[PDB]
Amino acid sequence: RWRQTWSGPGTTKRFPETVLARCVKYTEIHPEMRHVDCQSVWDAFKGAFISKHPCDITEEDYQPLMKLGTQTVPCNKILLWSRIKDLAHQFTQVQRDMFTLEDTLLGYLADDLTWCGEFDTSKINYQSCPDWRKDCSNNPVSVFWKTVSRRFAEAACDVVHVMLDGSRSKIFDKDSTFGSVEVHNLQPEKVQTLEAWVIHGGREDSRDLCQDPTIKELESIISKRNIQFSCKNIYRPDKFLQCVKNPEDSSC
Ligand SMILES: Nc1ncnc2c1ncn2[C@@H]1O[C@H](COP(=O)(O)OP(=O)(O)OC[C@H]2OC[C@H](F)[C@@H]2O)[C@@H](O)[C@H]1O
Known part of the structure; x- marks a missing residue:
């Protein structure tokens, strides 16, 4: 198949592996984040966008993640x-x-990464993802940042x-x-x-x-x-x- 669904780059290679690793490195390096279950964290990250329409993502979608990632x-x-x-x-x-936000667990897990799934299937899309401007604003990545960024400024x-x-x-x-x-x-x-x-x-x-x-x-x-x-x-x-x-x- 010679065409991609979206205009934006697809998921970063080795995404699940890469997030988990970053979670492990962060919680071992920062002692106050040591209480965090990294697989539990990944699970909430996946469950935010997996099997969901990548133009229909919501702030609530990320609420499980946000709770597991709570940080002072x-x-x-x-x-x-x-x-x-x-x-x-x-x-x-x-x-x-x-x-900076990138110095928090959540910011660190996501810095510089791209991610999206597909509706009706559990596969990650390593082909293409929604571009904020050419496709839709409510996409897994754009909604993540907007949510974590709001909380950061709130803090x-x-x-x-x-x-x-x-x-x-x-x-x-x-x-x-x-x-x-x-x-x-x-x-x-x-x-x-x-x-x-x-x-x-x-x-x-x-x-x-x-x-x-x-x-x-x-x-x-x-x-x-x-x-x-x-x-x-x-x-x-x-x-x-x-x-x-x-x-x-x-x-x-
Ligand atoms: N068409 C677009 N073009 C560019 N960016 C877009 C577009 N559409 C959406 N964006 C979003 O806008 C950002 C690109 O703007 P940025 O990386 O220069 O600095 P920000 O102030 O945003 O973010 C840095 C402050 O916000 C949070 C931290 F706490 C920093 O203080 C990307 O992350 C995108 O998610």
């Missing part, structure tokens, strides 16, 4: 990010002081940080998961300030990108939720990583 993370040490995945995780790799408190790509077309994009889901599920009762770190890309220094109009847009949004907004440029990304790595070379 330091609420004041949260780093959100939008369109700058690599630097944000390089950062939390060295600090370890701060946590945050005090000062929440967000990395942004200073060279992105729009530095802040209302339509990203950060912009459409996370900004709107921070709890004004618990969050004092959202602080944006705008990462410059070009050669060394530049503008004050915290004056960028999309950033002003983010600011107006967050201020009207009764949360303070602050912003800092990071004019030189690798001095930042020099300093984050070796926090007390006195060039820092």
Whole structure:
């Protein structure tokens, strides 16, 4: 058969094996997650999408998973990010002081993976999966992230940080998961300030990108939720990583 059902890439190779392994590595590495049954976790992950229509997935579908994956993370040490995945995780790799969603059990299990099934059959689809835009938004992957991302932002408190790509077309994009889901599920009762770190890309220094109009847009949004907004440029990304790595070379 010479045609695929969907426009999007199909399931990542060795998906069940890969999720289980990531679960084993995470629960052995993090002592508080040691109470977790990894096969039980996999079972709830499968049962969310297997034998289900990949355009008909719901938040409830993932509720079993969400319960088994319940995790407390330091609420004041949260780093959100939008369109700058690599630097944000390089950062939390060295600090370890701060946590992206990908640093939680659920985020870790799913980071960079694609998955879907078929209706009326229990097979995983290693051929193609629904593209969010060309096929349908309610697909196993898109619904997973939207659900875990909402809870993450719900869990945050005090000062929440967000990395942004200073060279992105729009530095802040209302339509990203950060912009459409996370900004709107921070709890004004618990969050004092959202602080944006705008990462410059070009050669060394530049503008004050915290004056960028999309950033002003983010600011107006967050201020009207009764949360303070602050912003800092990071004019030189690798001095930042020099300093984050070796926090007390006195060039820092
Ligand atoms: N047409 C599309 N094109 C791109 N992304 C799409 C599209 N349609 C849906 N998406 C979703 O949007 C994301 C791609 O945007 P991203 O990876 O740049 O950073 P986010 O702010 O989203 O996600 C990072 C923040 O949100 C959660 C963490 F806590 C971070 O702080 C993908 O994951 C997709 O699921």
